[PDB]
Amino acid sequence: VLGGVNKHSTSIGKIWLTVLFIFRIMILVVAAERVWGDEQQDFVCNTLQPGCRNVCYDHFFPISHIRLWALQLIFVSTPALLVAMHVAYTRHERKRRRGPLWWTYTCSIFFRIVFEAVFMYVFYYMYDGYQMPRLVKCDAWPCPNVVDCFVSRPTEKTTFTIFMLAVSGICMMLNLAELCYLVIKVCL
Amino acid sequence: VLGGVNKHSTSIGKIWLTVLFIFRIMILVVAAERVWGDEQQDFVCNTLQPGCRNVCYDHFFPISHIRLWALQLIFVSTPALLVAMHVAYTRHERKRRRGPLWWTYTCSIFFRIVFEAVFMYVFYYMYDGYQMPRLVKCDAWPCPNVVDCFVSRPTEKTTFTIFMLAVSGICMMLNLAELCYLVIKVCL
Amino acid sequence: VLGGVNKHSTSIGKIWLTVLFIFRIMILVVAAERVWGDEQQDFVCNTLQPGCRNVCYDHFFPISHIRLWALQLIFVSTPALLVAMHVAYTRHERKRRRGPLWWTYTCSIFFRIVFEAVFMYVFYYMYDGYQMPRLVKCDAWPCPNVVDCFVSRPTEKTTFTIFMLAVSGICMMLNLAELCYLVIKVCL
Amino acid sequence: VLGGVNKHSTSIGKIWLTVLFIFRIMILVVAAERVWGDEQQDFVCNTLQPGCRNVCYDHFFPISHIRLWALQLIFVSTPALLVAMHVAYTRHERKRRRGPLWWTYTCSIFFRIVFEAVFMYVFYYMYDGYQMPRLVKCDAWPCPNVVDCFVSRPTEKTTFTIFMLAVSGICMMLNLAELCYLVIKVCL
Amino acid sequence: VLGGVNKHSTSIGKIWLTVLFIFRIMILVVAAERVWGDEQQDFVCNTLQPGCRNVCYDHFFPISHIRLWALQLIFVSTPALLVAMHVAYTRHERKRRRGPLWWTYTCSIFFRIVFEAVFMYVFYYMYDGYQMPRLVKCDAWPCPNVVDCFVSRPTEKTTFTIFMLAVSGICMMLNLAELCYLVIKVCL
Amino acid sequence: VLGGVNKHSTSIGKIWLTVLFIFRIMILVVAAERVWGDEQQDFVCNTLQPGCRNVCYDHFFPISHIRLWALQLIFVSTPALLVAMHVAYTRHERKRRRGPLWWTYTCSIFFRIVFEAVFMYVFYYMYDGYQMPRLVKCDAWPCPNVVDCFVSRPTEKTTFTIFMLAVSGICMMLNLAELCYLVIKVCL
């Protein structure tokens, strides 16, 4: 909350973006330890081959969904943290002894859009959609021929995937709108 | 508590709604990790088919009850959080340099009613009542014919479902009463 | 502690009731996650029938003892919380612009007695005493004929049941004494 | 720490008793969840009789050691908490409008000795010493004849039992010394 | 944050190094209990020999990755903690009664580089790269001949290894730049 | 930190000893719940005898390594806590109404050395070195003849044992140096 206030921030940055960020954190907290907790423990494969459970789970879930969203939240909150430290350093220096603050705030908004877009593209490149399947067919060594494996709680995981994707998409649109608001105001 | 006080709020909003919100949170905290902890682990099905446990549990419990209530609490508390930030932003601007505060508070009450009603309808659309069955009959692939499966702690889960439904219904009535109090006062 | 002080409260309400409430909370904290943790996991039944463990445990323990005490503590502390908010609202209004405070405090004491009495009656209606048995005989479907099942830590659970029942009984007596003290003082 | 200071307390009550109380809490914290965590889970009995593990563990450990020490700490800290509230109530009343404080402090010391002595006598009546055996022989129904059962971590549990017994014995001696110091001073 | 500010610190030390340190801590928190939690529990070996799982896991993972990073963070933050205490001690002494502060800050930067370099060399000496294999072949006694063992979540562990190595490399470069900035300024 | 400052403390006690104490606590926190968590659970013995796992683990690990270090930290921090309370009691008395503070500080240093040496001797008397074996041969009843048992994570446990022993040895040397500094200063 505190690390989201600047003298150049409009109502969108002060209120709407801050609420959405808290919204994403709260959803992640209640859906991490309980929904994705038994992702590998309850991954069931119809085989007797030792080691087939480990390789098939790793093949279809190279990075867990919750770990991807945790990384995205850390990355998109970094520019806000950097700006806050710069403000304190400048405020300390000014007392001791647009402008520079305008460029730092504008640059932070640009990097927030880039990080938001990159992480959802990684999601689509890696899981080709939001729908978690009930069944995965795995043929990696040492599994003989093709082995059927069953995912844990596919429906609940799909529901939370739609929530995070929808909020992340809204966050980019708000960030894009704020970038346009600042640019046109200084230009015209 | 703090994010529930406005200069247009009556006694109902200041006291009764705040207590009920804390009441729902406290009940959720004591009944989440212990009552719904072993929902899938102690889901027992009378079969030898691999993967039948995963598909049958996911078929009858697409979203866990506690996750639905956690989502509802987050949604119904969002309008209160939005109003508080708007007050601080307006208070900061007024010093730096009915009305707008009346409309923001009135709009937040309307959205609280909508979110409360939507989540209760979703519950009845998804679980068709408050009574958790002891036995569920599942015929989804790969389960052969119809398989008997047994739920964990059905009676305790039914009791807490009644508590959350009753308090949610009371909270909707109180919000409706406060909305009527403000409308008639300004009209007459 | 703070939510237990009013200008009409005598020494009993200020000191003895506050200490007993903290006493009940402390006992519950140390005896919840460790004594009742494995209530169903270590519930052993002498049978080969799938699903008999789930139905027999649910039949004899419809609501866990710790969950009943947690609900009781929440209920008996609600009237105290309601009084505190009313005091703050009245104190704010008086500055901005017996009596009403006497009736609110008296009413809160009455509801504390009712909630205390109701929860112990529910305990006796549901578990017909304080002694937890070592053996339960269960004949609910699908268990064939009558099945022997064995409870986890029956002696330790009996000891803590006596503690909570005794303190709850003492708390009801103290509340009754305080109610009589206020009534006779105003009457005579 | 704060709830252990009174205007009639000598150096023993202010310093030595406070340090010992913190000493007992710290030892309990590091030795509860890890040493006694698997007391029943790793209780191994040489039998095939269902339910023999539950009844034999309950017969030889009716109350766990850590739960007994947790109860003792709660009881012996109650008189200190009662005195603190009485001081605040008297201090508030005096401003609003030996002696009584001397008797309350003296009575609290007496009850601390009684609670300390009662809990160790219960320990000796219940476990007849400090040495935890490696083997227990159990003949309670339904165990056939006599069944050998093996305790988890008997040596480590014995070591911590000696620590708590030694500190509890020292605490009584300090409390007894403080009681004698106050009595003779007022008498002579 | 507080233990990273000195009167001789430039913008790099005040802002960039502080953010990166928080960045490394945040990544470690979200990836410790969930990614490396089941490292040995889900270590599957294709054998019937008792004890082969323990010796093969210990042979290939003598120190866990998360424990190595936790040790590195503790070591690289020690010089900053030492400087802060020296500042407070000097500040207290000066009131009671370049220079010495310049040498202490310069020395702390040097030790941060050394600790950073040592821990990455230990990583390459011990795990000869960043890629975690799916399969390990173990022939330590008592495993007969050569036994195949399978690692848990090799792909996710590889991804986080790249993140920590990259940030640690960046932190070493920033520390080197700050050291050069101070040396040339005092020299010329 | 606060409980390590006295008016007679030199730079060694104020800075170096405080940092080392925090250093030992931080290492213990990250290496307790994860490295020693499965000490008995993953203790594997090559036998079919019931109860042999319990007696052999208890024979070779009478007290866990982490519990020994936790006890040592509590003991060596007690004299520092005792001194702080004595300072506050003396400071309160002086206002109400070398020297004594010099002897209390000197005595606390002496007891810190004794406790540090005693716990290190107990470690060598009990585990005869820092190297944890991979294999232990156990012949206690009821294990028939000699049974092979395998330790969990012996290499990682050895590494952390060296760390704690090295820091404890350094802490003893620093305490000895500070004791010599005070004695010679007062003598000459």
Numbering used by the authors:
A (entry chain E), B (entry chain F), C (entry chain A), D (entry chain B), E (entry chain D), F (entry chain C): 9 to 105, 125 to 215
Task: Provide excerpts from the study.
In an effort to obtain a structure of Cx26 where the loop is visible, we solved the structure of GgCx26, which has a cytoplasmic loop that is shorter by four residues, using cryo‐EM. Using conditions similar to those used to obtain the structure of hCx26 at high PCO2, reconstructions were obtained at a resolution of 2.1 Å. Overall, the structure is very similar to the hCx26 gap junction channel structures including having lipid‐like density within the pore. The replacement of an alanine with a glutamine at residue 49 towards the extracellular side of the pore causes a slightly narrower pore (14 Å) but would not be sufficiently narrow to restrict access to small molecules. In the GgCx26 structure there is evidence of both conformations giving support to this being a flexible region of the protein. As for other connexin structures, no density was apparent for the cytoplasmic loop between residues Arg 105 and Arg 125 (equivalent to Lys105 and Glu129 of hCx26, respectively) (Flores et al., 2020; Lee et al., 2020; Qi et al., 2022; Qi et al., 2023; Yue et al., 2021). The major surprise, however, was that when compared with the hCx26 structures, the map, with an ill‐defined N‐terminal helix, more closely resembled the map derived from low PCO2, which was attributed to the open conformation, rather than high PCO2, which was more constricted (Brotherton et al., 2022). In the GgCx26 structure, the linking region between the N‐terminus and TM1 is better defined than seen for the low PCO2 hCx26 structure. It is located more towards the cytoplasmic side than seen for the hCx26 structures so would pull the N‐terminal helix back from the pore as suggested previously. Thus, unlike human Cx26, the GgCx26 gap junction channel is insensitive to modest changes in PCO2.
CO2 directly modifies the gating of connexin26 (Cx26) gap junction channels and hemichannels. Cx26, like most connexins, can form unopposed membrane channels, called hemichannels and gap junction channels. A gap junction channel is thus a dodecameric complex formed from two hexamers docking together via specific interactions between extracellular residues (Maeda et al., 2009). The N‐terminal cytoplasmic helix from each subunit, which points into the pore, is thought to regulate the opening and closing of both hemichannels and gap junctions.
